[PDB]
Amino acid sequence: SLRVIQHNALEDRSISDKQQWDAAIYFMEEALQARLKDTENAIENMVGPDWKKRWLYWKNRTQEQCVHNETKNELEKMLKCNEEHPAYLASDEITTVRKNLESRGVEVDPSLIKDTWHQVYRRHFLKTALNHCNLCRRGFYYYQRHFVDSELECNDVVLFWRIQRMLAITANTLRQQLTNTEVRRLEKNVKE
Amino acid sequence: PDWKKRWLYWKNRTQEQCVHNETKNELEKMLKCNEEHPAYLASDEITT
């Protein structure tokens, strides 16, 4: 019955309320902020102090964290020059990156280069998602009417709202079925 | 024209000579970073 109800729970697919749209925006913003904090914690664990935190002491430096900082700076410059880049890394791109690193006397294993590239790619898409959320915070006029020449396509908000309502329906069904059957089963077991 | 000869006018520039000047500057920087280099050019070096 739970499987059938979960499959059938595909009723609502769009938001027609400004208040519901704002609530979905706030929930998505909270989730993205949590993800950003997790990514920042992972980056700090991988590298350590960064920017003001690193330069506050001005006398504490480590070669391992210096290599990570140089790789991060190189990837940031690459994104500034080329905003759009495929997730995968080709052989020539890896060779060019390694040659650029070794030009100043830095040798980095390809696995660490790939990991840093993946982390930087994730951070860039997190920033892009944050910018998209900022745009969609005012883009409700475009979203509601769906203009032909729309300058903004807000779909993540709708998807997250659909996920939230489906989860709420599933939780309500689970609670109901529990109260119907499992409470009585537990009472019978306790009595026995 | 190169260096003082090129910049004497300060208003005459050509894309063809600009490309050559940029290539010359890049090669000079490469020699400054790496004084010794083989005469032949490998595929990865050309790609870079």
Add this chain to the structure above:
Amino acid sequence: VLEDFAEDGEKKIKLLTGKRVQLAEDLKKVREIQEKLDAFIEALHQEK
């Protein structure tokens, strides 16, 4: 010309190679295959 094109579906297949045409043809073929399989299942259930 229109009659010749209509009386020759091979020409339509050769020319109409757009993404929409191919997707619609694939969807129609999948629907027909599923309908045939449903008919097979119904016939098997009725016979047994």
Add this chain to the structure above:
Amino acid sequence: SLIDMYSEVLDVLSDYDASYNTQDHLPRVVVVGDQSAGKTSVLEMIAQARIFPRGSGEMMTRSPVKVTLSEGPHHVALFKDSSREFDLTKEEDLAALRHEIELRMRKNVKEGCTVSPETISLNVKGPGLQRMVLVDLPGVINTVTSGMAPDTKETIFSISKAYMQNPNAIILCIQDGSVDAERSIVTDLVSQMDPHGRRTIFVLTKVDLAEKNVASPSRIQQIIEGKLFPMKALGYFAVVTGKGNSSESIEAIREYEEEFFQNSKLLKTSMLKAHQVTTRNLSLAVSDCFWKMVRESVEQQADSFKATRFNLETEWKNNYPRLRELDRNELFEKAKNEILDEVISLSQVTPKHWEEILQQSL
């Protein structure tokens, strides 16, 4: 009945596309052999009729051939798109069937190519047959012919891999008396792809020819008992399909095989199991396994195809939110209507503007 409908479904799946996307879902028993390995005689003996034309070295079979074993009112053969019942008894009918098969093979193969992706569907009916579908493929080659397409071997390998992509595809390996078990490319490929061999059953053909070639009886005993093949097959049976020549009738070969089974030089040595004789038990086991695997496959596909259709519909709707299904007929009708509207608009233009434009241009 069920077998005819299953064959029709397989034919529809094959005609769905020239590639292999949904054709690998339902199980398909495919018979793959070696070039000039006598597999033609074994295939003819399976159908109890000479229907495959013989080839003196040349690869006559260049397109996939579907053989559907079933039982009908008469022991005849009928194609999917044909109405003439090719009898499997009269010599003239057999010759006509072979000529039709050759014509179909030539039509599929392009004028200049060697292997054609088009398949040939044939249904075999008659008493004494089982209920299964057999697929015939060209033998695996090693050398490359300079006078043909250099990628013929690659195409054959790709076709074989696509056919083997089916997890429930039963492979019937056919060898020769002069060809050892390790010399069979098909057997080695099956072992490499299926080390366990829980669904592949080895069948030994032309035992008398191998025995007459001063072979070691210990190797034959080990092969029959299964002490040499690493795969754990469900069983091993040794049969004789004649000498492989083109001058022995089906009845004569059957009588010779029966005589050899009744009196064999290896059965009298008490070195072979008594329950590993004949083919009735093996055929029944193969039929039961095929039926259960096809039932499981169709049970899974009853939901798999629905999910695929739903996903395709969702993709079409998402890619074209403001456009519905546009097939060839509707798009052609819309183009015709647009052409008619353009012609109407052209005819409705004021003649004065035409006169002014023509005068100015001239």
Add this chain to the structure above:
Amino acid sequence: WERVSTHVIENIYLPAAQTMNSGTFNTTVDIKLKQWTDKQLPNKAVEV
């Protein structure tokens, strides 16, 4: 939601990390959701 956020992210965004059209992304999301519901989602919900 807190339990399956990581699972949803790694099963949706990780494969569809380079999608450009929103329709293709929505179709992939629907396919993944249907597959999860069919395979093990009720069992995971019951366990939770």
Add this chain to the structure above:
Amino acid sequence: AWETLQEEFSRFMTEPKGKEHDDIFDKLKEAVKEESIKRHKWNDFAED
């Protein structure tokens, strides 16, 4: 006159007034226009 008619027909067939102007229909329209032009006939009585 024939050249002017051909130019008008070509302009009508290829009229990218819409912002999309999908080329799938445009190729078919151009093919039909070329076929009609090649199949068109003239009467000498009209010339006289």
